[PDB]
Design a protein around this ligand. Structure first.
Ligand SMILES: *[C@@H]1O[C@H](CO)[C@@H](O)[C@H](O)[C@H]1NC(C)=O
Ligand SMILES: *[C@@H]1O[C@H](CO)[C@@H](O)[C@H](O)[C@H]1NC(C)=O
Ligand SMILES: *[C@@H]1O[C@H](CO)[C@@H](O)[C@H](O)[C@H]1NC(C)=O
Lengths: 99, 106
């Protein structure tokens, strides 16, 4: 007890209540959101999840920002590689940097 | 932000110390599954939809708007050309109808 502040807090009437949702449940929610996004784009946010091939969904998104979809299709490998490298950079930064 | 679904419109109603919004939204209802392709190969050229998406019921290819099934014959007014057929992954062979060709023929 002497080397722990939590025990003193508890002994003086100060306690911590657990969250209703566990970490596992929150991870399930995020995985459901991710599965919906990568399988159905934005359709599952408006109704039933409507499956669409992911490259075609990216063509839709390219249209959304004012770029013709042949730009996506003709550069598909380059765009996938750029995304993969960017994700890898995110992972490396989270692994290395400490704060 | 304005209800669940694609927002159409909203109507306000006063309430004691507050407001009530009646959000009217459009919700897609009865989905059917189709075969799809990103582009159509015709005469060695790649065709992409101008506004919709290429779909197949099993034997025939059409272009439809994305949020409501309305199949139409794939034509040069429906699509635009970009490059040849060698680059697009998943391109599908089909004919693209030219409206001017029958008129020139007749
Ligand atoms: C729709 O899905 C069913 C179930 O797998 C399949 O048998 C059928 O061929 C699909 N239809 C089209 C047009 O892809
Ligand atoms: C696809 O549609 C065409 C024209 O509507 C029709 O002739 C053909 O039989 C259909 N094929 C199916 C439903 O497998
Ligand atoms: C599409 O047509 C081209 C040229 O006629 C041919 O080389 C290619 O093999 C065809 N693709 C399929 C899937 O039949």
């Amino acid at each position: 007890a002497a080397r722990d502040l939590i025990c003193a807090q508890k002994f003086n009437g100060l306690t911590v209540l657990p969250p209703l949702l566990t970490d596992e449940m929150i991870a399930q929610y995020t995985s459901a959101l991710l599965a919906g996004t990568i399988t159905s784009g934005w359709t599952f946010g408006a109704g039933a999840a409507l499956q669409i091939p992911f490259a075609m969904q990216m063509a839709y998104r390219f249209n959304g920002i004012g770029v013709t979809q042949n730009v996506l299709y003709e550069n598909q490998k380059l765009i996938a590689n750029q995304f993969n490298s960017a994700i890898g950079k995110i992972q490396d930064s989270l692994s290395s940097t400490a704060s | 932000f304005c209800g669940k679904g694609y927002h159409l419109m909203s109507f306000p109603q006063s309430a004691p110390h507050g407001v009530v919004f009646l959000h009217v939204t459009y919700v897609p209802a009865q989905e059917k599954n189709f075969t799809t392709a990103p582009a159509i190969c015709h005469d060695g050229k790649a065709h992409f939809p101008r506004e919709g998406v290429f779909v197949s019921n099993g034997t025939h290819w059409f272009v439809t708007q994305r949020n409501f099934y309305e199949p139409q014959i794939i034509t040069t007014d429906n699509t635009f050309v970009s490059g040849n057929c060698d680059v697009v992954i998943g391109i599908v062979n089909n004919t693209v109808y030219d409206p001017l060709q029958p008129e020139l023929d007749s």
